[PDB]
Amino acid sequence: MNRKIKGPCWLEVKSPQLLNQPVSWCKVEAMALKPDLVNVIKDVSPPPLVVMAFSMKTMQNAKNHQNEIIAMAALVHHSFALDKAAPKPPFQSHFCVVSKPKDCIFPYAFKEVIEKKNVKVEVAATERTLLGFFLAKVHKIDPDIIVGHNIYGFELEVLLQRINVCKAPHWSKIGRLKRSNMPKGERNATCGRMICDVEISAKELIRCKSYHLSELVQQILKTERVVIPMENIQNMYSESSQLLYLLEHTWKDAKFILQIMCELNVLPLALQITNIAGNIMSRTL
Amino acid sequence: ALTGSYKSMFQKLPDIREVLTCKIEELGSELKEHYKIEAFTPLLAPAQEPVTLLGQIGCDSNGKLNNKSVILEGDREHSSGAQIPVDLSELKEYSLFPGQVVIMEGINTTGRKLVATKLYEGVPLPFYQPTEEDADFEQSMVLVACGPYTTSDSITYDPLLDLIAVINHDRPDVCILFGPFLDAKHEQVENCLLTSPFE
């Protein structure tokens, strides 16, 4: 209120002091003694940002009712316009990874088939290595906006719980700020990065029978996505071909989520709504 | 407790809902304050860590309750009255019946089916605090009997006569007589063979 800041707008800071020790994972840091030292400048256009669309497959543990992440996939777009049309293709790179939770023995010659196909995929020995690789990748890509399905309620919470249980190094890599102690967290979990759930945004924009991913893709993109029941994937891990099929299906799901977000252009809508209202874009999304 | 006769035999579904949710919420507040429970969570919220859940037990179908045909129905202010099946396979010791308010600390990682892990024995109300006058009462004997006071195929009410005889002989202080006094299920009245009005 005091600085008359109305949503995302170019802010110019005078007398930027450089703090001795890093406080975040960002490339540049600055200091401000008083709030009055920073002013608002208007006549500038928004810069392009990085957008990463991610999707993962959890599985209830065989023994007793615990979710376990086994497969991850994510598409990246470094230079994503926020005022122009959604870039086509919506991405220029991606990465996927798979792992055996506790006893799902890898099918014979799995990595051999992977290298034979020469498709973009890496194999992680265990959930801990999977999460470590994911955190390293997200930090190296520093995506400003991370978009997914059911991130608000299911995906983000399970990701955080798995990271905490596995005690993966630098859990704070998810957010741009570095914190030593686990938080316990409505938005503190992803401090610095903009999480966008396609279902809530679609509910905001369009109306559908049910906002589940399959129904949304049907009503929006007029295409059908094959649903893989979680109960059938228990034996899925004993054969390389169908495991690669599952991985490619997760990649397809990530592509569908990204396409829904792009064609529904929820990002520019959020920009304009936040600018009109002046609130925090994260609260808008 | 009904000094007068009554008001109505007309029911309203929203008002019955209000009564039910008020009962659930009152029991819940009492149990929460007694057990120092951190905070309840919505029934449909998928939480990985074990989370205490409040609600009344109910039978899934219209039949007798079975050990794996049980659902939990929450309160409005926490779960909006949603229902969720509960699995008692992991639970060790329990004692449930339909419509009992419980706090269950099971783990629900999917949001569609809870699995119980511990049940909180409900806490009784405090006893009645006496006074000096109450202790100033000598021993008194109480009689209590419950009808019907006539055999299944009689109207002579001989059991009532025997009860009156014992009451006179013992001279008890206070006698409690429960109904029915002319049973509605009695074959004599169920066939409306009586020659006099019920009253």
UniProtKB/Swiss-Prot annotation, chain A:
It is found in: Nucleus; Cytoplasm, Cytosol. Residues 162-220 are annotated as: DNA-binding. Catalytic subunit of the DNA polymerase alpha complex (also known as the alpha DNA polymerase-primase complex) which plays an essential role in the initiation of DNA synthesis. During the S phase of the cell cycle, the DNA polymerase alpha complex (composed of a catalytic subunit POLA1, a regulatory subunit POLA2 and two primase subunits PRIM1 and PRIM2) is recruited to DNA at the replicative forks via direct interactions with MCM10 and WDHD1. The primase subunit of the polymerase alpha complex initiates DNA synthesis by oligomerising short RNA primers on both leading and lagging strands. The CysA-type zinc finger is required for PCNA-binding. In eukaryotes there are five DNA polymerases: alpha, beta, gamma, delta, and epsilon which are responsible for different reactions of DNA synthesis. Belongs to the DNA polymerase type-B family. Component of the alpha DNA polymerase complex (also known as the alpha DNA polymerase-primase complex) consisting of four subunits: the catalytic subunit POLA1, the regulatory subunit POLA2, and the primase complex subunits PRIM1 and PRIM2 respectively. Interacts with PARP1; this interaction functions as part of the control of replication fork progression. Interacts with MCM10 and WDHD1; these interactions recruit the polymerase alpha complex to the pre-replicative complex bound to DNA. It is linked to Pigmentary disorder, reticulate, with systemic manifestations, X-linked: An X-linked recessive disorder characterized by recurrent infections and sterile inflammation in various organs. Diffuse skin hyperpigmentation with a distinctive reticulate pattern is universally evident by early childhood. This is later followed in many patients by hypohidrosis, corneal inflammation and scarring, enterocolitis that resembles inflammatory bowel disease, and recurrent urethral strictures. Melanin and amyloid deposition is present in the dermis. This is DNA polymerase alpha catalytic subunit. It comes from Homo sapiens (Human). The lineage of its organism: Eukaryota, Metazoa, Chordata, Craniata, Vertebrata. The chain holds residues 489 to 780 of 1462 of the full protein.
Swiss-Prot record, chain B:
Disulfide bonds: none annotated. It is found in: Nucleus. It comes from the Eukaryota. Phosphorylated in a cell cycle-dependent manner, in G2/M phase. Accessory subunit of the DNA polymerase alpha complex (also known as the alpha DNA polymerase-primase complex) which plays an essential role in the initiation of DNA synthesis. During the S phase of the cell cycle, the DNA polymerase alpha complex (composed of a catalytic subunit POLA1, an accessory subunit POLA2 and two primase subunits, the catalytic subunit PRIM1 and the regulatory subunit PRIM2) is recruited to DNA at the replicative forks via direct interactions with MCM10 and WDHD1. Belongs to the DNA polymerase alpha subunit B family. Component of the alpha DNA polymerase complex (also known as the alpha DNA polymerase-primase complex) consisting of four subunits: the catalytic subunit POLA1, the regulatory subunit POLA2, and primase complex subunits PRIM1 and PRIM2 respectively. Within the complex, POLA1 directly interacts with PRIM2/p58. The N-terminal 240 amino acids are sufficient to mediate complex formation. This is DNA polymerase alpha subunit B. The gene is POLA2. The chain holds residues 201 to 399 of 598 of the full protein.
